[PDB]
Every structure is written in C-alpha cells, then in structure tokens.
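Chapter review. Work through the record for Leukotriene A-4 hydrolase before attempting the end-of-chapter questions.
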Amino acid sequence: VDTCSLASPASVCRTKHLHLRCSVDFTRRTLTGTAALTVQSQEDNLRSLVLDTKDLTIEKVVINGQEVKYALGERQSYKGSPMEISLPIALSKNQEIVIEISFETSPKSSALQWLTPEQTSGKEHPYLFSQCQAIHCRAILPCQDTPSVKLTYTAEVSVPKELVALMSAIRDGETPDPEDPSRKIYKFIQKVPIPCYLIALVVGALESRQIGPRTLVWSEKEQVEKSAYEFSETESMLKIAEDLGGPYVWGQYDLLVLPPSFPYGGMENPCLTFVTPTLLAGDKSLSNVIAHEISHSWTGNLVTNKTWDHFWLNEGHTVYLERHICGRLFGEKFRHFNALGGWGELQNSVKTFGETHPFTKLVVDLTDIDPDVAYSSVPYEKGFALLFYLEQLLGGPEIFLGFLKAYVEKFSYKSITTDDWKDFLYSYFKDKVDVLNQVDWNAWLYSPGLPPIKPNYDMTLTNACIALSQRWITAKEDDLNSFNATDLKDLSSHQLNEFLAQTLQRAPLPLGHIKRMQEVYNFNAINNSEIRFRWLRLCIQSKWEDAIPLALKMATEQGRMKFTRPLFKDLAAFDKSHDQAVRTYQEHKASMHPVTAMLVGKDLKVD
Ligand SMILES: OC1CCN(Cc2ccc(Oc3ccc(-c4ccn[nH]4)cn3)cn2)CC1
Ligand SMILES: [Yb+3]
Ligand SMILES: [Yb+3]
Ligand SMILES: [Yb+3]
Ligand SMILES: [Zn+2]
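Structure tokens for Leukotriene A-4 hydrolase:
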C-alpha cells in the first residue's frame, strides 16, 4: 500500500531483524559490508521477495550458506531500483529465513554525507553521517524501505582506531579489528522494533560528556563545553514527557551535535538523536527543538505512520507534546504564544506553496512525488492546528493529554494510518461524539489551503511582538527617529524572533526602515541562528546591498534547509545578488549535502 516503495508489502513479506557487519573506508568513500536480513514470509509458497536499492552494487546474496540468483530492475528516479531475489526453496506463513546481502554503497549516495577534515570543526579528522528519513535507507542497505514494517537490528562497524562510531541503538562492546590492526570494531544493539528510516550511523573524532543519569552529549572536543549548557534541561524535559506519553523504554537517551552540514534542526533517531550546531545560541532558547526530538520517542518511535501520506501523525502530535513540555516548564502563556507562532509559520508556507496547491493538504497523494521535495510546514503546524482545535472543543489540556496517553498505549510498536487514528479519536471520546461530528473532516484532512477554523490563542505574550511589528509597518520617514534601543528593553529572545517573523510577512519595507533597525537594535551583532535568519531575509527582500555578504555567509556557515533554502532563493530574486547566489551554489556544490544540494538547485533553476 506504500507508493514510495518498490519492495514487497508487509501483507506479502515482513522483515523481523537485521545484522549489519560493515567497514567505513574514507579513502574509497564507501560502506563495505554484508547485511543479514532475518526476513519472515506472510504468504503461502513465496518464491521471490523484492527489496529497495538506490546507488548500490551487489557482489553476492547468501541464503542458507550458498549464492542465489538476484535481479535488479530499471531505475525510477527518487524511488531507486527494485531488487527481486529468487529464493532457493518456497516459504510457508510465519517461516523466518536469513538473507546475507554483500552490498556496496556509492560515494554520491543521497543518505550519507562524506566530510573532508577541512569541513569538520577539528581540521584533522574526517566525518560521516546519514539521514534515512524518509526514503533513504535504500541508499545505505537493501531492505523493505517502508514505515509499514518495524524491525530489530544488531550491528558491528569497522572504523580506524583514531575515530568513534555511533548508531541509533545502545552500545555493547569495543574491540580492535582482526585482519586490520589500525581499526576498531564497535557493537550496537536495538532490541526495540524500529523502521529502516530511523536507522542512522555517525563516524568521526567524537567526545562525550554526561549531562544527567541517562544522557550523553556527543560532539568534537572544542564543541562539548557549550553543548553541555545549551541542552542541560534534557533530563528534566524527559521526566515531564514521561508523564505525557508513558515510560521511557529505550535504556539511554543521547544527543549528537552534528557539523554545520546537517540539513535539519533535529532527527528522531532512537537512543542517539541528531541535532544541528545552529541550536547552540548560548542562552538555551532553541531548547524546544530538543523537546520535539524527546517527544518523538513516543510519536514516531512507538506510534509510526504506516505510509508517508500519513506523516502528519508523526510531527503534528510531536509539536503538541513539544509545546506541552514548554507549557509545563514556562507556563500556558508560553504554550499559547508558540501555538500562535505555529499558525504564523503555517500562513507563510500556505502563501508560498499556493492556496489550492496539493502539498498544503494534511493527507497528500505521494504517487509520482518525492517526499523530501513535499516537506513543508503543513505536517507540523496544520497537524497541530487540528489537535489544538479538538482540545478546545472536547475539553482542555488535561482531558486531551489523557487521550494521547491512551493513544500511544493503544498503537505502541505499531504502524498506523489516519483512518486508524480517527477510529480511536471516536472510541476514546465515545460520549462527546456530538462535538466530534461538528468538525468538517474533508476540509482539515483532504482540502488545500488554510484550515476552515482558526482556534483561540492567549495573546498575552504575542501582543508586544505585534505592537512593535505594526509600529514599523505604519511608520513613515519622520517616525523612524522615535525607535530606540528602549523598544526591546522588555522583549525576550522568542518575542524578538516573533517580531521579526511578523514584520517579514509584510516585507519588503523601505530601505531607510531596515537601515534604522540596525542603527538602534544592532541585529547583525546577535548570534541567535533563528533571529539572524529572518533579519537577513528582511534586508535582502527590502533590497539592502550591505546584507548580501552576510546573507551568503550564513548559507555557507551551516547546512540546515530551514535557513539555507530561503536565503539562496531570496538572493536569486534580488537583482544585485542573482549571479553570486548561483556562483556560490556551483562553487560549494561538492562540499554540500546530497539532499541540501538537490533541493537548493531546483529552487535556483540550476541542473
Ligand atoms: O525532523 C525531521 C524533519 C524531516 N525529516 C526529513 C523528511 C522529509 C520528508 C518526509 O516525508 C513527508 C513530509 C511531508 C509530507 C506531507 C503530508 C501532507 N503534507 N505533507 C509527507 N511526507 C519525511 N521526512 C528529517 C527529520
Ligand atoms: Yb553487552
Ligand atoms: Yb469506528
Ligand atoms: Yb508623519
Ligand atoms: Zn521531527
């Protein structure tokens, strides 16, 4: 039933375990290894199973200790290639057989990003990291690349003795390689069933420091110190999150601070989450991105989406818990401010992509469409917009959180669709069905544009941001002298970012307005990756030539697509930077991430 896959569905075949024995050769830029898939049959007399590949070369397929005949079909863009494996002898229902595939990756694989020592914040050692979400585990190893299949895994990775190898699992051992003395083999065990898109590897000159009874923060020697401070609230957040979903059954929770290159704020990888170094502002304000990945240990890591059309079930429900952690740490005044900010981001994505556009619906049709392209603010904020509306109809926070605690409990270790969620939303609230029936279902789930109902948000914290935003938009030439550093003497870092976000929706503003802002507030001096981003966009949209060097620099400074893609598109629209925007892309294309370079290129109209 999964459009984004070329393999046999869960109804025909199901993978139960995976044993990965590989080596990381940085000279060759490949992942030399053998994958042992303890595959189970769900049909009587199964003669052949199909698997997902992309940029792979197979040496041999070993079943029962013998070479078997395998066939690889014709390549289909982002989906990759189907790998039909002819079985030696037919399978019965629930009959488990191991398949050892001797794969070989590509140095230009869409999942892995190979780093030159110069690209790292160590300058003396190389770095390697993956990103299997959504359809990129096929670019690492041949498997049933579908979130309709949850599997366990045990792994052994051979890397040089001078490096540290880490996976999305709990570590077991540490011993040197037998037929390579300059190498060390690291063991990883994942007893908890997890889909292939959540499997991740990271190798490099890493170092760890404890920040609580179950957390380890991983980054290079000269990045550990501020990593310990910025995410020091993780232990307290986890204790709060447990009273929202249930027990934390993963053993250890770790944070891994990636090099700038990483294209996402955070990735929900179990036992070892993936975070961007841009989160480090030094004040602990970007801590909500940690609250999002903690919340993912319940939604996405326990209750996973069966197909990618139902992705909103992951992020949307996670944004609810993320704001609830912040709404138990900083109050309901903050939870409502963030929820109001969410609609704001949603408005920006709906106006950009288009109102009647297909990728603005909550359940979209990913037939002949790449999920990495269709990624926007719709499954995050529109998915939350639904939940917050339901909450303000069925009761309140305590009542709706009670539904989610039962929801995680009901579909734990399982892969579900939007149809499965709506049944439980009607089964849990079996007495408040009258309220549930008032809700237009086709308008929130299958219709494009803004949702038909805008919920009620507490404007207590948000009003100040709007007051200062409206002050600038309404201001004339003579009015600009009224603005002083006094203006933001009470506005917080989140409120300063909200003011910039509100102004950017009404951008471009006169060039004199922008110039004045820097003369009194000094927005260039700030090191907050969220504040700096919107401010740079505001100048480039308003045609400020002084901002061109800074705007280009921020896009090369980091790899997060939340900030790089807007910048490179902004400078492409702006006449005095259109050439530089293109020139920087092609000169930095080699150093870029295979996902970052792919999406930026299309937005710049470059092949
Ligand atoms: O923190 C996370 C951030 C995102 N991933 C990468 C990623 C990209 C796309 C994706 O698949 C999608 C996205 C949106 C929709 C959709 C449905 C209705 N509208 N839009 C459907 N499928 C899944 N993962 C990395 C870690
Ligand atoms: Yb052990
Ligand atoms: Yb039902
Ligand atoms: Yb005036
Ligand atoms: Zn997420």
